Amino acid sequence: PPPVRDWPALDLDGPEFDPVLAELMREGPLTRVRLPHGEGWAWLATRYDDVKAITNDPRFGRAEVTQRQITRLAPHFKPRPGSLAFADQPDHNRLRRAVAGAFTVGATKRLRPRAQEILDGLVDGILAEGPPADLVERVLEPFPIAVVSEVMGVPAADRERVHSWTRQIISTSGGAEAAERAKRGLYGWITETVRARAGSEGGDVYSMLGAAVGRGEVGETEAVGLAGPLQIGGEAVTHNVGQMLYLLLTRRELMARMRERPGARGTALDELLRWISHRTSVGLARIALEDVEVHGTRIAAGEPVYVSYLAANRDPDVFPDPDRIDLDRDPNPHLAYGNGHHFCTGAVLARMQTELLVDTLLERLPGLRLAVPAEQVAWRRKTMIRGPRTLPCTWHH
Amino acid sequence: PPPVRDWPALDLDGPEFDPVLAELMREGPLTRVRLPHGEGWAWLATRYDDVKAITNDPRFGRAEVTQRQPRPGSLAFADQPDHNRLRRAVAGAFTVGATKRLRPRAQEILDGLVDGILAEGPPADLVERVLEPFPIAVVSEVMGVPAADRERVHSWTRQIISTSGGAEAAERAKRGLYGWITETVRARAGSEGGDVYSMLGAAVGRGEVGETEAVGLAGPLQIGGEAVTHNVGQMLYLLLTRRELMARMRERPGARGTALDELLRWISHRTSVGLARIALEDVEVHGTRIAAGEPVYVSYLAANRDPDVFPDPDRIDLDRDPNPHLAYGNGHHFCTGAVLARMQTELLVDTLLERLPGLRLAVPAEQVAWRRKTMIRGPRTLPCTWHH
Numbered sequence A: 001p002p003p004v005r006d007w008p009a010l011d012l013d014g015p016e017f018d019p020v021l022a023e024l025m026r027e028g029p030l031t032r033v034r035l036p037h038g039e040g041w042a043w044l045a046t047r048y049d050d051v052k053a054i055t056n057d058p059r060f061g062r063a064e065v066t067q068r069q070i071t072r073l074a075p076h077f078k079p080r081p082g083s084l085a086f087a088d089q090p091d092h093n094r095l096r097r098a099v100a101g102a103f104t105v106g107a108t109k110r111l112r113p114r115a116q117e118i119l120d121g122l123v124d125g126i127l128a129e130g131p132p133a134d135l136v137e138r139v140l141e142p143f144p145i146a147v148v149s150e151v152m153g154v155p156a157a158d159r160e161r162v163h164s165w166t167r168q169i170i171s172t173s174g175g176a177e178a179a180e181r182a183k184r185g186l187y188g189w190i191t192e193t194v195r196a197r198a199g200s201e202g203g204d205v206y207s208m209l210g211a212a213v214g215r216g217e218v219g220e221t222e223a224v225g226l227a228g229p230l231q232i233g234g235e236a237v238t239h240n241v242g243q244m245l246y247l248l249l250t251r252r253e254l255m256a257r258m259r260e261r262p263g264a265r266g267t268a269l270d271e272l273l274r275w276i277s278h279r280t281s282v283g284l285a286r287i288a289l290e291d292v293e294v295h296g297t298r299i300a301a302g303e304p305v306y307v308s309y310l311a312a313n314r315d316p317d318v319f320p321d322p323d324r325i326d327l328d329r330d331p332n333p334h335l336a337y338g339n340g341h342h343f344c345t346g347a348v349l350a351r352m353q354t355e356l357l358v359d360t361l362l363e364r365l366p367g368l369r370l371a372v373p374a375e376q377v378a379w380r381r382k383t384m385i386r387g388p389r390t391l392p393c394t395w396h397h
Numbered sequence B: 001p002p003p004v005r006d007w008p009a010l011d012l013d014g015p016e017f018d019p020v021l022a023e024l025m026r027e028g029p030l031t032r033v034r035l036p037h038g039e040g041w042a043w044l045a046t047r048y049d050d051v052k053a054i055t056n057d058p059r060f061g062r063a064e065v066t067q068r069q070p071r072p073g074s075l076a077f078a079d080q081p082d083h084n085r086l087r088r089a090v091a092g093a094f095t096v097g098a099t100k101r102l103r104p105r106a107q108e109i110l111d112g113l114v115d116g117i118l119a120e121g122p123p124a125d126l127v128e129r130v131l132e133p134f135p136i137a138v139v140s141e142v143m144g145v146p147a148a149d150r151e152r153v154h155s156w157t158r159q160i161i162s163t164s165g166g167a168e169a170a171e172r173a174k175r176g177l178y179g180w181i182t183e184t185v186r187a188r189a190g191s192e193g194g195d196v197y198s199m200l201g202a203a204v205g206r207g208e209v210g211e212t213e214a215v216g217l218a219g220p221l222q223i224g225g226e227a228v229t230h231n232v233g234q235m236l237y238l239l240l241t242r243r244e245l246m247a248r249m250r251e252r253p254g255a256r257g258t259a260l261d262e263l264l265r266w267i268s269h270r271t272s273v274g275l276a277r278i279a280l281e282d283v284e285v286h287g288t289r290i291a292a293g294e295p296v297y298v299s300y301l302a303a304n305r306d307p308d309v310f311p312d313p314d315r316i317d318l319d320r321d322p323n324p325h326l327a328y329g330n331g332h333h334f335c336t337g338a339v340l341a342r343m344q345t346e347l348l349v350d351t352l353l354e355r356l357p358g359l360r361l362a363v364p365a366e367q368v369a370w371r372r373k374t375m376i377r378g379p380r381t382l383p384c385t386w387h388h
């Protein structure tokens, strides 16, 4: 076989695709890579089809991954009971069942209005204070959160604790014991919550869950593990949209389109979604459960495999001229939200927040543009999700 | 396990001490309170000595609170040696020598304000006409605001948002004033003078503090005035409703220092405790293990009512022997304007008691409302009248 490759945790200063990934891509359909932490190496599927296929083969377990030392990108690794991330059917299915209702298309169409109201207040502020403002800390961050806390079902008196605790995201890292108590707060509060809310209607996520624990269908010890991620999830929109904006704000050709013909931002937003390198490397792996012949290659049982949707999204077979941003692509079946029964639970809710951000920010912030040079925007370092550290923008006042 | 006590805001309508705190003080030297906005609980020392120690013991930082739940260059959130470097920079325009010096100008500015009310006539609100405008002016002299930048700096600095009004608007005044300060520091970068601004820029021009920190070091100061505007506002209040006080005052001038001290120790200047301190190395207090990383508060107020130190703590004596109150903090985090506010206070009390012969409240005591939802306590207005 081909020699194992080292895939360091490099910090690109920009939206730049990962070069080493680019390399592994042209090295063959499958490659062996060694990540920063954890022992051994791991398989890597770069081709669209193999990826979609690998992510949909029942023969790949994700639970076993909680018990091994798979070569990983993160320093620490502590999976928690209830987490969908390591859920395996029938488990997974049982769990998502308890919260899925809140993220449905019908569930999100009903929120748009209340989420628009939210965003509007936020815009009301920067508009009123004046142009020199950081869209990242004034809109893009407190917004996905608030909207999610709405779906989650955080009360109105709790509306300020929860937000204030959702500082696990931070600018970068508040500190080792910093976001520690914070994550220890939200999670505590959540148990407290779920414990009450037992036996109660309301599509409210904490209600459904807490009622499910009532019926023991997802009983505690799984609660703060299932809702945990869903609560903190807004974080992704805060960085992905931060990037959509960054490209729009540094590539006049894109902003032109985005503006010269709104109500057409639909495919454009899909293009950005596909093209953007959302995370810094590869996420959680999947363990091969019984010797699979992935793209003419005997992957033995017990062996771990990863998938790079990022690279998958660049497959020339599927996306002609993959590296060019187009904004006007055909059906463009990208995979930013994942695939298989581990597809993004918030994809639909995320899109809605994305469609509000771009539309609303481009609308109320007339002639929106960077307030500093492009070289002035810094990027998050050493973290799963890639993104601008801030965004100083200005607008006609 | 001292069940965490709950210490809500304070919708107090008067100069009344805070009863919740009155209660908290009885539980014991150490207690566990929970303040409104915020997540979690914190400790609280109420006895004099403990507070005059927690505040004076290295093992409790201030900058840590900055990485928890401030702007680069805030004396408030400062540890050592950064507190000096920073304080030293501007500490000379606030010395007893710098103040005794300023006194005449301050006395003049005040007289100016007084001339105005005297002319117009008896029904007047000392607050919006004297007590409030005065400190800004006097502090701006200290800060060294160029005579042309009066109507503007004074304008902005009025982002105290009286009771409320423009919370997203006060952000503009805060961005322009702070902007303005940054410029004043860029220039004067090679200056000299008491003028805090020039004197800062001077050190800035020598990187003894570097820019950035500039706008945050003088940020508070510039605004600092209001504290005097409300503390005296209270002093007067107690004089205009508590006669025995006003009597001691009028029939024994020359001896108003003690009285001004007693007033300082009694008045509950704020609605609650200020910033907290973090136990840097996990210390203990009175057989109580304070875990490192845990927050702790101290009430100078409660500290000023300590029976051990101030016998008959709640009584307003006006003649108290030494009375080592703690109205200006303790430890390096001791008030930088303490001396500047003392002179202003004395000029206010003294001038007003002479220029406004037989000063009297023009309305009933219950007609004087108080500030709500704000850190510092005080009258919203003070309708007074005098011999015309």
Ligand code: HEM
Binding pocket: A055, A084, A085, A086, A148, A229, A230, A231, A232, A233, A234, A235, A236, A237, A240, A278, A283, A309, A336, A337, A338, A339, A341, A342, A343, A344, A345, A346, A347, A349, A350, A351, A354
């Ligand atoms: C548009 C921004 C977002 C992107 C690009 C994104 C992307 C992804 C990806 C790639 C995965 C993993 C798929 C796999 O394992 O193969 C995932 C999982 C997940 N995402 Fe997102 N996500 C976004 C927003 C959100 C939001 C807003 C939430 C909820 C507040 C959310 C909740 C989740 C959850 C709960 C999972 C775990 C699903 C499972 O394993 O069953 N995501 N997301």
Ligand code: HEM
Binding pocket: B075, B076, B077, B139, B220, B221, B222, B223, B224, B225, B226, B227, B228, B231, B269, B274, B275, B300, B326, B327, B328, B329, B330, B332, B333, B334, B335, B336, B337, B338, B340, B341, B342
């Ligand atoms: C007589 C009215 C005033 C009272 C009762 C007062 C009281 C206090 C108190 C109790 C503290 C606590 C310090 C701490 O523990 O962190 C403090 C700090 C401070 N005060 Fe005042 N103050 C007054 C007027 C002023 C004025 C007019 C200024 C500006 C010229 C000012 C500037 C400051 C500053 C800069 C600090 C922070 C000191 C540090 O942390 O090193 N104060 N004040």
